[PDB]
Ligand binder design. Structure first.
Ligand SMILES: *[C@@H]1O[C@H](CO)[C@@H](O[C@@H]2O[C@H](CO)[C@@H](O)[C@H](O)[C@H]2NC(C)=O)[C@H](O)[C@H]1NC(C)=O
Ligand SMILES: *[C@@H]1O[C@H](CO)[C@@H](O[C@@H]2O[C@H](CO)[C@@H](O)[C@H](O)[C@H]2NC(C)=O)[C@H](O)[C@H]1NC(C)=O
Ligand SMILES: *[C@@H]1O[C@H](CO)[C@@H](O[C@@H]2O[C@H](CO)[C@@H](O)[C@H](O)[C@H]2NC(C)=O)[C@H](O)[C@H]1NC(C)=O
Ligand SMILES: *[C@@H]1O[C@H](CO)[C@@H](O[C@@H]2O[C@H](CO)[C@@H](O)[C@H](O)[C@H]2NC(C)=O)[C@H](O)[C@H]1NC(C)=O
Ligand code: CLR
Ligand code: CLR
Ligand code: CLR
Ligand code: CLR
Ligand code: CLR
Ligand code: CLR
Ligand code: CLR
Ligand code: CLR
Ligand code: NAG
Ligand code: NAG
Ligand code: NAG
Ligand code: NAG
Ligand code: ZN
Ligand code: ZN
Lengths: 636, 636
């Protein structure tokens, strides 16, 4: 029978052994070592076959007390479209074994067998090294490299007090993909291409990655972090001595404390309770000085838009929570602080304004309407010769639209996905439509088109946006059709509005023409919903400015409050647009690329660009509504 | 250096070799054979270690020309909640290699090394066999067994003419879960728990599995079918010498031809064009004898309900088509014949009735209304003393509702899922509500409650169904509240309708209480939408019967047409209810259990139970609408 010790070459690490193997010869090495308490050892084996022989690859086997590994040196990889890759270098890190005080020091023996089947002979170069850069320390950076045939991994231990940590991985060149996984301390460790996704959370990456971990999940308060390269780049983006070495840097930082949650929530509540305080103060000062269809329509639409997306987000959140695959939701992982089951608490709590400001506007408008109704009950002719008809439903509809938009944005931000590009700014389409209708009706007679012209316009707009995003991704015929339809609609609107100021239609048409030229040259927004939002905002602002200039030309004085409101609306729009243009993550594109553009929070230690965008959108909409309501106070 | 031949024990298959291994002793066998053209050989290795030694397992390494395998005898499996299992027998199949005529006969060697590290020694029994039942033949069954540590797989080759095949796997005891995968002929083959899902299509199963495969995808027209058992049953259902042998039977059958498609399409079209032909002939015979809000409401609701579901289903279908994981959509896999990109073409084409019947009903109602308007233009006092008010909006609303329900059902059936449990029969809620409203308006005066009473009722009903299904899965308080609310609603409806026939209110209340007791003693429908449909159908039929019997008590003769329509409606309703009670697949429950109840098609070789339910529902609803419209002909 075979004797290992007899033929075993008592060897030592760090020595570059060389040899040649025939059909009737096997080489065996018998490395030995010891492990002491409080320290972790991780041997690593490198094998390079200088020869390129492929019909008789070298076979390598590693044996320990309780594990066996085996592979080939000329590693062969198969890729789509019948492509073959051959790597002539291989490496592997053996699973470590802890040594406690009770166990004491432990002696370990490792057998390495190299054998081939080539009739003539195959060369091989073997190397074995200990690892000193194995453990990881919080807040301390680290650099290394990996390859398709050289997967890597390291260990981390949980400090005494830290209850949550964040692992951030950064590269420079995103040519080949990579996969980063986290696993418990239980050998074996699946650091291979086809089994790295079996266990533990994992993330695809090309230039950035971030993973948040708790402490109660892991027994023993330790875990292994595994990095694996991929032979091909199809999954992450474009197409695909052969090597693909990738340089990586990994950092681990403790997470924030609940004090951040308390401070952020209190600040968010009070910053917008201040508006109610100011409104009550102004009402008190004024009192001292003095000393229908929309309702059911909006309720039905709210339920219709709420139930389906709400169930969808519930299911998606549950699935991502259970499976542990962080590639379904298009979060911004750099700043996404979870609470309970919720994974992104900030992006939802940053929606308080879209509700509070809307409810305040509802309250103020209702009070004004009730006061006017009581005054009319008392009767006064001053509002006939020196007054104009008053309407109420439009403002309530605007406010309820604002509340529903806030709730829709929250539900959408629960878990972003490519199937939810709308529901984020859909109701601001209605808000702009209501503003346009209010402006049309205030000047010209009522001539109400009931209420369903706006609903038809909204449905058509949504249909066009969805069809363009789903199908007009790479086509241009649909783009030409949409451009022609937009130009025709603009011309028709100008003609209808027209019937000293004869050049206003020309100005608006020329602006829109510059717009078509702009994106015809650009011809690649790739986000139809964002443009629809922008164009509706443009039209709203242009029409408001035109009406204000017309009123000024009419030789009347604007009350100071509407003037201040208009200026505040302009500045708030400026800030909100600045924050909106900032892009963090995007549903379009592979999840590897979407995370590539992330940022590490601004303002407090909680919020980022999108939250400030929510805040500015809410406040700017509130002030625009106030401008619309209070502009014509001087007429009475 | 070590010498394999010097220590090689030239062995033979089918002999149970026995041995004992120490730290310094490892045994090696050198099996040898030859493969001839037109035959496939697949060795198989069984290793059993009698001892239970866990600290010092026996390590086995198998070496071939171009591959290396390795494992331990006492295989260890880790399961959730910190559970450990050990299996003392292992088996494996070595990847075969074809031998072409040009290549000629090929000699092959296989080295099996058994080595351990126990200080004293461990026993081992080794068996190596050839495989004769490796290839699979079309339409021929096959029986075998698998174990968590003994995965299996076989080869299949595409016949000359077969262009698509179906693989069906059947078991008897659903205790241990299983996975069935299909892969291309390119070694290695992933038949392990942690890497079986990496490549090729696959399906989880407990009692039944079915997979459909084309020909152009596979180069060489061959593929491997791999069956792998799982240590625990958490994924596919409930909770978890040790052994979990599972017996399986496999069948492979060629798929249908396009003539089936042509036959099914022609039959589906002409069965429902027959109704138009018959109506035209009836009108011909009659001629020879003679010789607004709803529109906008429904158009808005159409887009409002459709766009999100359409986009979601498009994304789901694309992802399932590309990724190849057949566990997202809850199809009925046994009879799902795909066309182009669509995966279940039959379940979509089976909705033609919901549109054709609706269109015919709208045409007929419009014709009748137009001739009535012409007659009124000519004027006739007969329809005053012996006439009743005539309305038109409700019938068009019903027709449009049917036409929209057809598209909603099609969109839902594109890919059923737990997030689309509605949209399969949701619009028929409104259908029943509008039928109820029409009946109420017919006898009593107009007293129109506009149209939004039904809108609010539908929104509230959908909200209740959603919150019950998503939340009320396991709770009883919500069920008690719902029962109380429904009893109160029944009492209120009875009181309102009441103000010879003094006992009908008691009868309806008692029927409601009987349903109460039924679902309070069963306490397990677990399908809120289904019971909502049942209850709407029940009250609709009850009111129809009450009205018809009251009309009978009024001493007037009904025209033969209403009698024929009522009888046909009753019969079609019974048939549709029967076909509805049949259960094929279900979104609730794991995908393994959903497929456990599937059936192999009825009628032609295309359609099955659910399609028949669609047909019957369409026809029965059309006849019910006709009954309502033509019931009161005798009055004039
Ligand atoms: C085995 O490997 C050796 C290369 O080291 C070669 O065989 C050797 O041949 C020389 C010259 O005849 C002998 O002196 C050695 O004793 C042989 N050693 C062995 C291990 O065979 C050859 O490359 C391989 N064997 C064959 C048959 O090719
Ligand atoms: C296999 O090939 C690689 C690369 O050709 C060898 O890696 C070299 O290692 C030395 C050691 O410092 C470096 O100076 C060289 O720069 C490395 N090569 C390259 C291309 O950078 C490796 O030594 C060879 N053998 C083994 C067993 O890995
Ligand atoms: C090696 O296996 C054998 C069990 O068969 C044991 O060692 C044997 O001991 C006897 C008595 O001294 C010798 O005659 C044999 O030559 C030994 N065989 C070998 C292979 O060493 C023992 O279980 C194992 N070795 C040790 C050191 O325990
Ligand atoms: C390992 O153990 C298994 C059972 O634990 C042995 O399998 C037996 O195989 C024979 C061969 O026909 C059957 O008659 C027995 O019924 C099987 N055992 C049982 C419990 O049913 C097997 O022989 C052992 N060794 C190997 C190498 O498999
Ligand atoms: C009523 C209005 C104000 C609510 C608006 C936000 C809604 C959509 C939020 C508030 C609370 C949230 C829920 C809180 C907890 C969980 C449990 C988790 O396992 C699934 C998601 C689920 C069920 C959340 C879904 C989203 C949710 C329902
Ligand atoms: C406009 C909205 C976002 C403003 C905030 C209101 C709602 C959504 C907030 C207020 C209080 C919040 C809850 C507070 C505490 C918990 C318990 C935790 O285990 C799950 C989440 C859950 C249940 C939160 C979900 C979101 C919540 C319901
Ligand atoms: C970001 C992508 C989707 C493109 C959207 C562009 C939008 C947000 C931008 C581009 C052109 C801009 C407009 C250009 C000119 C004017 C006239 C000015 O008197 C009021 C503001 C207004 C109306 C701007 C508002 C913001 C605007 C509409
Ligand atoms: C004409 C009126 C409407 C303008 C008021 C809105 C202002 C604040 C908007 C309009 C266009 C916007 C800019 C568009 C593009 C850029 C370039 C980018 O690298 C930094 C932000 C910056 C500079 C934006 C900041 C905000 C911005 C200046
Ligand atoms: C015109 C009305 C009646 C059509 C009603 C059926 C609808 C839902 C059907 C008709 C055509 C179908 C599409 C045909 C082909 C594909 C390509 C596939 O990669 C994604 C799904 C998609 C895009 C289908 C989605 C469902 C679909 C849109
Ligand atoms: C459910 C009701 C509304 C469907 C009635 C409309 C029929 C004619 C529609 C619905 C879905 C359609 C199919 C959708 C997708 C494809 C795949 C493509 O490669 C060929 C055309 C084909 C096969 C379409 C033919 C027309 C089609 C069958
Ligand atoms: C199938 C699941 C959801 C359970 C519900 C079953 C439903 C559809 C069943 C159970 C009780 C049944 C009703 C029992 C009694 C009557 C009165 C009769 O004059 C007409 C049929 C009618 C109205 C039945 C229609 C079908 C019905 C409503
Ligand atoms: C005509 C109107 C009043 C409907 C009358 C109700 C009839 C048609 C319904 C009520 C209960 C139903 C039965 C309930 C259960 C089963 C068992 C199943 O294995 C076959 C169908 C069968 C036998 C159903 C057939 C249809 C059925 C008999
Ligand atoms: C190395 O020395 C012997 C030789 O294999 C071995 O038995 C022992 O356990 C090892 N001890 C240390 C300290 O490495
Ligand atoms: C082992 O002893 C060292 C001695 O300082 C101590 O620091 C360490 O905490 C001990 N570990 C255990 C597990 O007892
Ligand atoms: C078996 O015989 C020898 C012994 O190993 C081997 O070299 C040869 O290739 C084999 N021949 C056949 C016909 O199996
Ligand atoms: C090999 O020869 C046999 C002889 O009958 C024939 O049937 C088979 O088709 C041939 N195969 C090839 C690939 O030539
Ligand atoms: Zn947002
Ligand atoms: Zn159906």
């Amino acid at each position: 029978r075979r004797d290992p010790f007899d033929a075993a070459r008592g060897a030592d690490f760090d020595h570059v052994y060389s040899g040649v193997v025939n059909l009737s010869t096997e080489n065996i090495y018998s490395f030995n070592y010891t492990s002491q308490p409080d320290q972790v050892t991780a041997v690593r084996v490198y094998v390079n076959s200088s020869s390129e022989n492929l019909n008789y690859p070298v076979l390598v086997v590693v044996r320990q007390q309780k594990e066996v590994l085996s592979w080939q040196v000329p590693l062969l990889f198969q890729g789509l479209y019948q492509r073959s890759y051959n790597y002539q270098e291989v490496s592997r890190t053996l699973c470590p074994s802890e040594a406690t005080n009770e166990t004491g020091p432990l002696q370990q023996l490792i057998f390495v067998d190299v054998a081939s089947m080539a009739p003539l002979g195959a060369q091989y170069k073997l190397l074995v090294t200990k690892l000193k850069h194995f453990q990881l320390r919080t807040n301390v950076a680290f650099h290394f490299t990996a390859s398709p045939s050289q997967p890597q991994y390291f260990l981390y231990k949980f400090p005494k007090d830290v209850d949550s940590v964040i692992i951030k991985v950064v590269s420079e060149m995103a040519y080949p993909c990579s996969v980063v996984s986290v696993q418990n301390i239980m050998c074996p460790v699946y650091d291979l291409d086809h089994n790295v996704e079996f266990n533990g959370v994992y993330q695809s990456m090309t230039k950035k990655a971030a993973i948040t971990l708790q402490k109660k999940d892991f027994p023993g308060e330790q875990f292994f972090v595994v990095f694996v390269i991929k032979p091909e780049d199809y999954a992450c983006g474009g197409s695909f001595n052969l090597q693909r070495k990738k340089n990586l840097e990994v950092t681990i930082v403790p997470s924030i404390k609940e004090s951040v949650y308390v401070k952020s929530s209190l600040f968010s509540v009070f910053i917008f309770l201040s508006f109610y305080l100011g409104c009550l103060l102004v009402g008190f000062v004024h009192y001292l000085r003095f000393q229908k269809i929309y309702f059911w329509n909006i309720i039905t639409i709210a339920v219709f838009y709420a139930l389906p997306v709400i169930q969808l987000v519930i299911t998606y959140q549950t699935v991502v929570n259970v499976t542990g695959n962080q590639d379904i939701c298009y979060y911004n992982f750099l700043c996404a602080h979870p609470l309970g089951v919720l994974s992104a608490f900030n992006n939802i709590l940053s929606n308080l304004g879209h509700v509070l400001l809307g409810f305040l506007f509802l309250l103020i408008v209702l009070r004004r309407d009730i006061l006017h109704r009581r005054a009319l009950e008392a009767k006064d002719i001053f509002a006939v010769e020196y007054g104009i008809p008053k309407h109420f439903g439009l403002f309530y509809a605007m406010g309820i639209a604002l509340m529903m938009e806030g709730v829709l944005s929250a539900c959408y931000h629960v878990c972003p996905n490519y199937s939810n590009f709308q529901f984020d700014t859909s109701f601001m389409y209605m808000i702009a439509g209501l503003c346009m209708l209010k402006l049309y009706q205030t000047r010209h007679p009522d001539i109400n088109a009931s209420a369903y012209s706006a609903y038809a316009s909204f449905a058509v707009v949504i249909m066009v946006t969805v069809l363009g995003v789903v199908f007009g991704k790479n086509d241009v015929w649909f783009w030409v059709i949409f451009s022609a339809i937009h130009v025709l609609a603009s011309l028709a609107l100008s003609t209808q509005i027209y019937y000293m100021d004869r050049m206003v239609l020309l100005v608006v048409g020329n602006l829109v023409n510059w717009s078509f030229a702009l994106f015809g040259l650009i011809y690649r927004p790739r986000d139809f919903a964002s443009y629809m939002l922008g164009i509706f905002i443009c039209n709203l602002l242009l029409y408001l400015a035109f009406y204000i200039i017309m009123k000024l030309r009419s030789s009347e004085k604007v009350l100071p409050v509407p003037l201040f409101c208009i200026v505040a609306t302009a500045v708030m729009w400026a800030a909100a647009l600045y924050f909106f243009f900032q892009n963090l993550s995007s549903w379009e594109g592979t999840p590897a690329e979407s995370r590539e553009k992330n940022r590490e929070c601004i303002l407090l230690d909680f919020f980022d660009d999108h939250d400030i965008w929510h805040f500015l959108s809410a406040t700017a909409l509130f002030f625009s509504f106030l401008v619309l309501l209070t502009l014509d106070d001087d007429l009475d």
